[PDB]
Amino acid sequence: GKIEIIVVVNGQPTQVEANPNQPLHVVRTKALENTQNVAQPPDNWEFKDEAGNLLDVDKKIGDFGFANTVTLFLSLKAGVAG
């Protein structure tokens, strides 16, 4: 009952295997580690689906109604320089 999620971070995909009872934040941590995206910590990133909706990171993966071949975009909440 594992679910395959392609997570895209700065344009780079990583496939993360997920179980239905895992919150989405579990996949966030894994995708950032897999893609070496470290300059801001995991809580500073958020998920959007292909339709562009912001996803609740605390919701269980099985509750979204993903199809087996889902792509999600994981992007920063904010970028600042000065």
Partner 1 sequence: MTPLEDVRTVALPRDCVSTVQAHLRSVGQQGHAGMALWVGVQQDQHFVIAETVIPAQRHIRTSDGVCVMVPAEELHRLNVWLYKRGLTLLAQIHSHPGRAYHSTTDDAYAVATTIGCLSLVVPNFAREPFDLARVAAYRLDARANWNEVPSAALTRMITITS
- Positions that interact with partner 1 (CB under 8 A): 8-13, 35-40, 46, 48, 52, 73-82
Q: What are phi and psi of 41, to 5 degrees?
A: -75, 165
Query: Which of residues 11 and 82 has its CB atom nearest to Zn ion in the complex?
Result: 82
CA neighbours within 13 Å on the CB side: how many for 61?
22
Binds 21: which of partner 1, Zn ion, none (CB < 5-8 Å by kind) = none
Could you tell me if 4 and 17 are in contact, meaning their C-beta atoms sit under 8 angstroms apart? yes
Q: How far is the CB of 43 from partner 1 (least distance, A)?
A: 13
Maximal C-alpha separation, the chain? 47
Binds 20: which of partner 1, Zn ion, none (CB < 5-8 Å by kind) = none
